Design a binder for these strands. Sequence first.
DNA 1: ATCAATATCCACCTGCAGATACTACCAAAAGTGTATTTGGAAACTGCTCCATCAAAAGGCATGTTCAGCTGAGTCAGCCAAATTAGCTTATCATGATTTTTTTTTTTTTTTTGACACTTTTGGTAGAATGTGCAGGTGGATATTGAT
DNA 2: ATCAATATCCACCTGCACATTCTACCAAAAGTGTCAAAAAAAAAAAAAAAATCATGATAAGCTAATTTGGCTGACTCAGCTGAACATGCCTTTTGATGGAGCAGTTTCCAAATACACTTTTGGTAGTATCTGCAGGTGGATATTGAT
Lengths: 79, 84, 98, 98, 106, 107, 93, 93
Amino acid sequence: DNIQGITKPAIRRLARRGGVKRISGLIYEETRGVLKVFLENVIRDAVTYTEHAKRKTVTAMDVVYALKRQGRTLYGFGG
Amino acid sequence: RKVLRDNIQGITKPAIRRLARRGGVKRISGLIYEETRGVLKVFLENVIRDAVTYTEHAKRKTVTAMDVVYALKRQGRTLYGFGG
Amino acid sequence: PHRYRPGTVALREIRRYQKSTELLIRKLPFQRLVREIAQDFKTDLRFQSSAVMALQEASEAYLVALFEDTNLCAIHAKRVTIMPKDIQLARRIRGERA
Amino acid sequence: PHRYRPGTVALREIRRYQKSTELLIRKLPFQRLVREIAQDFKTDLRFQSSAVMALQEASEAYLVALFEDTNLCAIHAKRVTIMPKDIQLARRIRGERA
Amino acid sequence: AKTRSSRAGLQFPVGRVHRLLRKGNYAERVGAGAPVYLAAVLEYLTAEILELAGNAARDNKKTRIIPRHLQLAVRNDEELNKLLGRVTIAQGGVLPNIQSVLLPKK
Amino acid sequence: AKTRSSRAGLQFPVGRVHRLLRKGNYAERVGAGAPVYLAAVLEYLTAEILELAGNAARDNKKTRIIPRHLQLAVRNDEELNKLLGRVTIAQGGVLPNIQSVLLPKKT
Amino acid sequence: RKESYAIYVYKVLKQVHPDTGISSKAMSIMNSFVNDVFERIAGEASRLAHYNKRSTITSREIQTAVRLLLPGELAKHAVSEGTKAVTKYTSAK
Amino acid sequence: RKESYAIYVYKVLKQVHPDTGISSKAMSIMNSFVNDVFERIAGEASRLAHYNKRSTITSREIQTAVRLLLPGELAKHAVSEGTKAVTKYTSAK
DNA sequence: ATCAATATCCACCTGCAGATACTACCAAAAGTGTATTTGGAAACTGCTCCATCAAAAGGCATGTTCAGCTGAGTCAGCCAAATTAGCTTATCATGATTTTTTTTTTTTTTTTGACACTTTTGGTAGAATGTGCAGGTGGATATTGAT
DNA sequence: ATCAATATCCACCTGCACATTCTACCAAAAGTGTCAAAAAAAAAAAAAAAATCATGATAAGCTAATTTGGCTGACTCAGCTGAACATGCCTTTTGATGGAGCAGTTTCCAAATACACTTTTGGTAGTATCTGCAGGTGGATATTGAT
């Protein structure tokens, strides 16, 4: 597990907001795939931001600063 | 000194097609040939507008290429080959 | 007895969440994952509640939009079932696969 | 009198231009469309001989790279004929249209 | 009791901007007008934002203003939306939209 | 009489990489090790691309690189491509490809 | 010690709707809005500056930078207040 | 005079491909490349500092940047080719 | 299963644009040496807060069944738009010239930053008052699903 | 359309939580008067580059027409999903205690910025030298659509 922790009827909650009509079977995974890859990409850059600051913990900024350089900005935790 | 108008038509159906191959296209509809032009019109206006804007700040009358270039870079369409 | 033609508690959920902002993810199956992942980069990593809560946002909101973009992709094909094939497209046409 | 079946000029044609790197749009009609649009932004503007090509290479490349993002859409819906309803999507997913 | 902010009649930290502007290394030398003009554009937007963001509480009777207030505004405004088009507001949700075809009768 | 470039073993101008680092003022003090490391990455990346670039010229039986190659090389390399994925090579044309359904098949 | 635009956000909030507050989770969303914008207009102003060899950002830069960033009409008004804010600064002790 | 790396490219150019040629059209695309990369890195570097209240840019930043701006295999290689260059310098003269 | 007409093309030969070298030499540039500063690091540790429980409460997940569905197989008329030739315009590559815009250099008039000195402020930390948001409880209204 | 079958918005609310008021304190901050740097501001003047123009020359756009085939609306079984719902797992949330860790601080080392001085270089410039890739030509091969 740890990837499957992302519950099926829940993914549909997110699918909901997007105005997802019905849904599918093979989707849930295809999705589990994206989400994962999205993550790595951020976390990596972040984890790298964390490590530049001789830390062990990953701050809020640590992420922000990643999400920025990655194109997907995020207002709200910059404080 | 001659009134410029309707040059979005110089983008002839021929060429409008010539590109489309390189883009890997086979069958091309008909409403198409226009819809394209009027996209390119929007492209140019978004760039020129910035290019020209980097020209006015320079107290210039001459749209230089750096001008343009810096305008593509600023839009996400970074271009290599014209100095800069 | 009374059931529901496939649509209602699909819609009243749509209508629901689209009307809400709360997170649609249990703060752990996830956060664990989040931890799994990071390790693949560094050891004994700590995460300010603040951090994991961000990705959480980002990560979800992201999935959201991809879905919208996804949807059309399907509807584009005169259907209404978000098929795997869709994503592929959407995420390719975006840039995620080019 | 000989011809070439429906579509055996295209597949031919394509192959032709894909290995080339010369600008399609004619240089002249383009340049005018350029000075026309910069005109209605700033009257009396001069353009460096080059800076216009800067715009053509750019403008081109773009168009060429949206047809692509087009088939990948028409094709999505078993067709092989590019149409506005298509382009439009490609642009919407691409996050463009306004 | 006069500060550049005061004389320029401004409600934003017009003083710290001349600091932040150099600290960020966005140069060396900073003229004296810029630090101002900047603040202004800054003050303007902030309000223009909160504004549209405000009427949002008038729409969802609540008086105060929470994220969804801003988010609902921005998206519902052309300009802003464009400007924020690649920014994501935490606790924003989407917009009650259903590509027609997804509803009943066909 | 000995350049820093030869001091550190590279070729790209170390000092130039330094001076520019200032004239841009990306920070207050450009340390002493940085410019080196930089000119260093730049030398790598340049050699990395010219190589896949030449080879491209070798295939196309030419002995003079012309953008088409640079492009040909940059598009045909998973990595480099993503580095340049938002950059456009003037005069580079696209990659020789075609979709499949477009192909004329079935007897 | 930490900083923030928070107060000046309120002082201005306290200029459009004296009868209104702001959730803490909307303040930061307003801190990050501002904080962000600055960084934009600035660098764009910084570049403007370094594109001309000039060693100084001026009101001009900030403008040709504001015009470059903010959209159509949302851009014109912007240039406005700005100018004002400035033009009032000049004549005022 | 306009500065340019048309030589540091060329030198490197022969090294890999001794008897190969490089057009003007392409040497340009290349001068535009080194440069792009520079700014790109020289900027994330610049940034890290600020991100960590530092006034100096160092091989400590240029690295974290390369690891940030450069993808996989490429990166791991730059960091390397880099480190070396530094070390050998910190032992040159 | 052959056939001719079409066109892509393997190699060849050749001449001027384009790339390669020669070469002096300049001012900007980068190395070298020395006084002088200070950035941030090694070290000490206070105060934030991240991890790990165990409790409890039940909701949100999961696993099976059921029918209504629309996704996918399937065919076939109308008609969109491929394509192939019939003519003449607007582009272009030669080639240069006109005139105006940008770049080179130079004087002084204004603007800015830094230096050491006042004085102003907005966070910091409790403590604290007041306003309303959560959400939950009463319920007819509400949509839709089969009769 | 009627009616049971299962779920939403208005509403009265009031508990608890937190949005706001104050009270004071200062650690850093914003402005002041002054001084000397420098940058912008301007300004007559060489150098480069764009617009303007003639011209033969034309493949490239245009445009009519002929027509193979994709576009498109429809028939229809069935694989697929929502829906419907009931055994029950672990995610929340109170609530906590503990200890890793990041943050505040004081001093010194070594690293860096600044001026001194020397002189290495990479770039403009008149210069010619040199070579290849483009443009013509012959014709070999593979494609192609009808017989």
